[PDB]
Design an enzyme around this catalytic site. Structure first.
Site, PDB file in Angstrom:
ATOM      1  N   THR A   1      -7.021   0.527  15.772  1.00 21.14           N
ATOM      2  CA  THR A   1      -6.074  -0.469  15.850  1.00 21.14           C
ATOM      3  C   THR A   1      -5.992  -0.920  17.270  1.00 21.14           C
ATOM      4  OG1 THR A   1      -4.744   0.951  14.836  1.00 21.14           O
ATOM      5  CG2 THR A   1      -3.822   0.154  16.275  1.00 21.14           C
TER       6      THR A   1
ATOM      7  N   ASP B   1      -4.738  10.218   7.799  1.00 21.71           N
ATOM      8  CA  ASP B   1      -5.387   9.113   7.516  1.00 21.71           C
ATOM      9  C   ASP B   1      -7.358   8.904   7.771  1.00 21.71           C
ATOM     10  OD1 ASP B   1      -6.455   6.384   6.824  1.00 21.71           O
ATOM     11  OD2 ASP B   1      -4.398   5.415   8.099  1.00 21.71           O
TER      12      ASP B   1
ATOM     13  N   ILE C   1       6.958   6.498   0.907  1.00 23.59           N
ATOM     14  CA  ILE C   1       7.355   6.617   2.412  1.00 23.59           C
ATOM     15  C   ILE C   1       6.048   6.330   3.274  1.00 23.59           C
ATOM     16  CG2 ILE C   1       8.082   9.548   1.418  1.00 23.59           C
ATOM     17  CD1 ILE C   1       5.575  10.049   2.086  1.00 23.59           C
ATOM     18  N   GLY C   2       5.023   5.573   2.609  1.00 22.73           N
ATOM     19  CA  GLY C   2       4.615   5.114   3.327  1.00 22.73           C
ATOM     20  C   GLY C   2       3.223   3.552   3.010  1.00 22.73           C
ATOM     21  N   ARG C   3       2.790   3.119   3.325  1.00 16.31           N
ATOM     22  CA  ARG C   3       2.340   1.679   3.147  1.00 16.31           C
ATOM     23  C   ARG C   3       0.855   0.859   3.952  1.00 16.31           C
ATOM     24  NH1 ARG C   3       4.967  -0.404  -1.295  1.00 16.31           N
ATOM     25  NH2 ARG C   3       7.158  -1.125   0.239  1.00 16.31           N
ATOM     26  N   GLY C   4      -0.069   0.815   3.739  1.00 13.22           N
ATOM     27  CA  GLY C   4      -1.014   0.307   4.128  1.00 13.22           C
ATOM     28  C   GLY C   4      -1.926  -0.220   3.493  1.00 13.22           C
ATOM     29  N   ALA C   5      -3.385  -1.580   3.867  1.00 16.18           N
ATOM     30  CA  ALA C   5      -3.712  -2.501   3.199  1.00 16.18           C
ATOM     31  C   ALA C   5      -4.472  -2.396   2.323  1.00 16.18           C
ATOM     32  CB  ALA C   5      -4.785  -2.433   4.119  1.00 16.18           C
ATOM     33  N   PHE C   6      -4.654  -1.449   1.823  1.00 19.70           N
ATOM     34  CA  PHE C   6      -5.134  -0.965   0.492  1.00 19.70           C
ATOM     35  C   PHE C   6      -4.151  -0.256  -0.766  1.00 19.70           C
ATOM     36  CE2 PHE C   6      -9.639  -1.409   1.701  1.00 19.70           C
ATOM     37  CZ  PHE C   6      -9.718  -2.661   2.193  1.00 19.70           C
ATOM     38  N   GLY C   7      -2.923  -0.114  -0.113  1.00 21.64           N
ATOM     39  CA  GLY C   7      -1.571   0.918  -1.073  1.00 21.64           C
ATOM     40  C   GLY C   7      -0.460   1.615  -0.290  1.00 21.64           C
TER      41      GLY C   7
ATOM     42  N   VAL D   1       1.863   5.864  -0.224  1.00 18.31           N
ATOM     43  CA  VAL D   1       1.800   6.972  -0.282  1.00 18.31           C
ATOM     44  C   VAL D   1       3.498   7.081  -0.592  1.00 18.31           C
ATOM     45  CG1 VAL D   1       2.379   9.136   1.543  1.00 18.31           C
ATOM     46  CG2 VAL D   1       0.324   6.887   1.579  1.00 18.31           C
TER      47      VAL D   1
ATOM     48  N   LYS E   1      -3.885   7.648  16.582  1.00 19.55           N
ATOM     49  CA  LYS E   1      -3.087   7.021  16.807  1.00 19.55           C
ATOM     50  C   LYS E   1      -1.718   7.619  16.423  1.00 19.55           C
ATOM     51  CE  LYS E   1      -2.493   2.970  13.274  1.00 19.55           C
ATOM     52  NZ  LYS E   1      -3.743   1.808  13.106  1.00 19.55           N
TER      53      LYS E   1
HETATM   54  C1  LIG Z   1     -12.250   1.636   8.122  1.00 12.18           C
HETATM   55  N1  LIG Z   1     -11.594   0.996   6.999  1.00 12.18           N
HETATM   56  C2  LIG Z   1     -10.849   1.703   5.371  1.00 12.18           C
HETATM   57  C3  LIG Z   1      -9.908   1.004   4.561  1.00 12.18           C
HETATM   58  N2  LIG Z   1      -9.095   0.858   5.737  1.00 12.18           N
HETATM   59  C4  LIG Z   1      -7.922   0.092   4.535  1.00 12.18           C
HETATM   60  C5  LIG Z   1      -6.498   0.718   4.529  1.00 12.18           C
HETATM   61  C6  LIG Z   1      -6.326   2.377   3.506  1.00 12.18           C
HETATM   62  O1  LIG Z   1      -5.348   1.840   2.908  1.00 12.18           O
HETATM   63  C7  LIG Z   1      -3.818   2.864   3.077  1.00 12.18           C
HETATM   64  C8  LIG Z   1      -3.303   2.803   1.701  1.00 12.18           C
HETATM   65  C9  LIG Z   1      -1.923   3.211   1.784  1.00 12.18           C
HETATM   66  C10 LIG Z   1      -1.894   4.173   3.105  1.00 12.18           C
HETATM   67  C11 LIG Z   1      -2.156   4.108   4.155  1.00 12.18           C
HETATM   68  C12 LIG Z   1      -2.083   4.692   5.553  1.00 12.18           C
HETATM   69  C13 LIG Z   1      -2.014   6.870   5.367  1.00 12.18           C
HETATM   70  O2  LIG Z   1      -3.753   6.331   5.040  1.00 12.18           O
HETATM   71  N3  LIG Z   1      -1.531   7.015   5.221  1.00 12.18           N
HETATM   72  C14 LIG Z   1      -1.521   8.835   4.628  1.00 12.18           C
HETATM   73  N4  LIG Z   1      -0.851   9.843   4.601  1.00 12.18           N
HETATM   74  C15 LIG Z   1      -0.802  10.496   4.702  1.00 12.18           C
HETATM   75  C16 LIG Z   1      -0.584  11.647   4.543  1.00 12.18           C
HETATM   76  C17 LIG Z   1       0.038  13.492   4.086  1.00 12.18           C
HETATM   77  N5  LIG Z   1       0.654  13.586   3.986  1.00 12.18           N
HETATM   78  C18 LIG Z   1       1.113  12.760   4.133  1.00 12.18           C
HETATM   79  N6  LIG Z   1       2.883  13.180   4.280  1.00 12.18           N
HETATM   80  C19 LIG Z   1       4.079  12.432   4.263  1.00 12.18           C
HETATM   81  C20 LIG Z   1       3.131  10.633   4.756  1.00 12.18           C
HETATM   82  C21 LIG Z   1       1.919  10.794   4.728  1.00 12.18           C
HETATM   83  C22 LIG Z   1       1.313  11.834   4.091  1.00 12.18           C
HETATM   84  C23 LIG Z   1      -2.264  10.766   4.410  1.00 12.18           C
HETATM   85  S1  LIG Z   1      -3.160   9.434   4.954  1.00 12.18           S
HETATM   86  C24 LIG Z   1      -3.698   3.553   4.232  1.00 12.18           C
HETATM   87  C25 LIG Z   1      -9.228  -0.562   6.348  1.00 12.18           C
HETATM   88  C26 LIG Z   1     -10.063   0.746   7.741  1.00 12.18           C
END
Ligand SMILES: CN1CCN(CCCOc2cccc(CC(=O)Nc3nc(-c4c[nH]c5ncccc45)cs3)c2)CC1
Ligand SMILES: CN1CCN(CCCOc2cccc(CC(=O)Nc3nc(-c4c[nH]c5ncccc45)cs3)c2)CC1
Lengths: 389, 394
Positions: free
Chosen positions: A228, A207, A77-83, A85, A191
């Site tokens: 951002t 996040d 349900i989600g994507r980001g730089a390091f992985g 969700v 954001k």
């Molecule tokens: C300062 N630097 C740190 C490292 N940074 C890399 C990005 C981290 O990598 C991610 C990997 C996967 C997903 C994400 C996006 C993210 O943080 N998604 C989140 N989703 C939830 C969440 C909780 N319950 C949910 N229910 C539905 C959908 C999403 C969620 C919490 S954080 C980032 C760059 C900035």
């Protein structure tokens, strides 16, 4: 005394926030065994005899402790730089969660500590909760509450947001940010992507990877810009060696960008290129304009402009109460203290505990010749054996 | 199983003194990682440098709080061995008196042989037997292993044998106690392999307890054990243990019964049955026990004592104890009216120690720089063979 020493040692093992609690200690052993089990290191009898002794035990511990195979992944349900969700269901408990994966490999080519802490210990209806955190040789896992209502990007793209809804969502963001600020952190990446809605339509910030702990003066000293392109404040954008000292007012600039986006349909400093957006932020005094469309109220334009100004004259320099007292929030439907108990503008119509209608369809380390210790920067990430109840 | 069952099994694993993953072993794992990593050459690696910096404060606290050598006041050095010493200590805080065995980690790595202490730690910590010297605490530092045990003020059987020409009634008592003590170890699943009077200690009442479990091995499914290790001084070692040089043969608990025969002979005759000027000469006499075992021509040793010595000092296949302890217990040499096997440790011992204090060392005769490991260029893991040695009684 002997008993005092014994008891101080015992509290150091039980404490959910201790570095020598059982979770860290098991992490320490699991990391040693991951980093040592390679043929090149096994040539060393100390390493080979150690691994052989702990072989059976490490397999038992690995089987008993939380692991990825305990979760049934329903949808990414989600994507980001390091992985990613992923919407998961814990096979045994049948409980539904959102699980964030962070690539150990990718992170190597420290941010997750505050994100783990804020989510695990906030104990706030405005902060996405962390239930479990675990790891293997490839990832970090964060087992959080699933937010079925989706984010504000999704909402904004399906509705022409009226001012009464915009007022609600802004008011909730304000209360949510004030909650984080009171815990001593600046979000630095506010954001709509980070604003999630629960089953009742109420907001929670997500996040926390950009969160930084404020000093005694309520400031943060940073040399590298963070956030951002569209929502970044001028002082965070230009943050450097000499300058680069800022407070919680950087999150308030982002609220102004958010309000503008909701009412206008576009971000205030949109440009054809990313570099053009940077230029427009720096020149906010002349680049911030409103379309000649009679829809935006005097009060909404005033809030957007009170936030979208230089830090020194920015609304929120004297705290939240000056934001809360803004005429844009003047309404006869809710009160600040009771807001999260009111009925949300959009109440999610959900078919099941795994309903994903608000979510669109979506390598590692080489073999070491010598001890590298790639698992050492993640020792103590586990939140399972010593959780705060 | 369920989620809660898994959670709880993991929790009990952390508290279990028999567990390889309980808190003391886990703290050992971390303490060992920090000892082995804190060198400038390894600190060039950011993963290692950042890890050590993070755990710096914590590791200092843990080191300070956990049991350490400076918690003990050393009264006298009452014993010496290949890898260290046994010292009579008093725990500074509790004021309790113990015997503390030190094992050099440098020596155990230099000479290899850094795995013997496991069975010795377990036997002493968990035997819960009046026949086995008790282990109260086991701890360690970058250089040593410590074993905090009950102090045995009565001394050993070597000391007794040197002060008295042992009468048969005493020899019967001490042999009977050795037999019960060995049967206790055997029931726990171990063969001692080094039964000798040096390893037979007397408590404040004059009753025996076996010590020095450094040669102990756990028996397999068929009650057998297999070894290749060197045999330090052969006076009491059985023909099988000597034939088993370099992974030759599997042997059982009957090797400890041979040693009881050597012991009985020593007590009544004054000398070991196979003594020679050289080690190699003793080995020759053991292997030729059929012709080398003789008794002096003086009627002093009874028919029954000569029979027991000879029932034990024979080849394993016809050795007394091949069919268990009851055939030893029923031997005519043990026939007496003074005691019963089941009640023996409640009877009054032949020699009762007369002791002046809790730190009386009258039965203990009075008693070089310490070489250190070099600075590693790469990870060596010298502390890894000692992870999980720490133990605390409740
Ligand atoms: C300062 N630097 C740190 C490292 N940074 C890399 C990005 C981290 O990598 C991610 C990997 C996967 C997903 C994400 C996006 C993210 O943080 N998604 C989140 N989703 C939830 C969440 C909780 N319950 C949910 N229910 C539905 C959908 C999403 C969620 C919490 S954080 C980032 C760059 C900035
Ligand atoms: C093939 N491998 C087998 C293991 N080998 C290790 C030698 C052990 O190194 C020692 C160091 C110091 C002392 C000793 C002798 C010893 O075991 N003494 C013991 N004393 C006691 C004891 C308990 N309570 C006491 N009370 C009074 C006097 C002594 C004690 C238990 S073990 C051995 C090396 C060759």
């Amino acid at each position: 005394s002997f008993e005092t020493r014994f008891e101080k040692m015992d509290n150091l093992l039980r404490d959910p926030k201790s570095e020598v609690n059982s979770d860290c200690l098991l992490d320490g052993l699991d990391a040693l065994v991951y980093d040592l089990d390679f043929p090149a290191l096994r040539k060393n009898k100390n390493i080979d005899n150690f691994l052989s002794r702990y072989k059976d035990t490490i397999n038992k511990i690995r089987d008993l402790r939380m692991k990825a195979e305990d979760y049934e992944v329903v949808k990414v349900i989600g994507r980001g730089a390091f992985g990613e969700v992923q919407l998961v269901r814990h096979k045994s408990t049948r409980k539904v969660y959102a699980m964030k994966l962070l690539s150990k490999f990718e992170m190597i080519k420290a941010f997750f500590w505050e994100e783990r802490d804020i989510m695990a210990f906030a104990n706030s209806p405005w902060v996405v909760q962390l239930f479990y955190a675990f790891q293997d040789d490839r990832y970090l896992y964060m087992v959080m509450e699933y937010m079925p209502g989706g984010d504000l990007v999704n909402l904004m793209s399906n509705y022409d947001v009226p001012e009464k809804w915009a007022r609600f969502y802004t008011a909730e963001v304000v209360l949510a940010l004030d909650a984080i600020h009171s815990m001593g952190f600046i979000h630095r990446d506010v954001k709509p992507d980070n604003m999630l809605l629960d089953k009742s339509g109420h907001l929670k910030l997500a996040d926390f990877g950009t969160c930084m702990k404020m000093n005694k003066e309520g400031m943060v000293r940073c040399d590298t810009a963070v956030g951002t392109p569209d929502y970044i404040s001028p002082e965070v954008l230009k943050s450097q060696g000499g300058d680069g000292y800022y407070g919680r007012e950087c999150d308030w600039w982002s609220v102004g960008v958010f309000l503008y986006e909701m009412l206008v349909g576009d971000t205030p400093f949109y440009a054809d290129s990313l570099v053009g957006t940077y230029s427009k932020i720096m020149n906010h005094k002349n680049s911030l304009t409103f379309p000649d469309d009679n829809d935006i109220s005097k009060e909404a334009k005033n809030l957007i402009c009170a936030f979208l100004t230089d830090r020194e004259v920015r609304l929120g320099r004297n705290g939240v109460e000056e934001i809360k007292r803004h005429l844009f929030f003047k309404n006869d439907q809710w009160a600040w203290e009771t807001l999260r108990d009111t009925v949300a503008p959009v109440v999610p119509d959900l078919s099941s505990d795994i309903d994903t209608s608000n979510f669109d369809d979506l390598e590692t380390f080489p073999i070491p010749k010598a001890f590298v210790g790639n698992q050492l920067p993640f020792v103590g990430f586990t939140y399972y054996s010593n959780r705060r109840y």
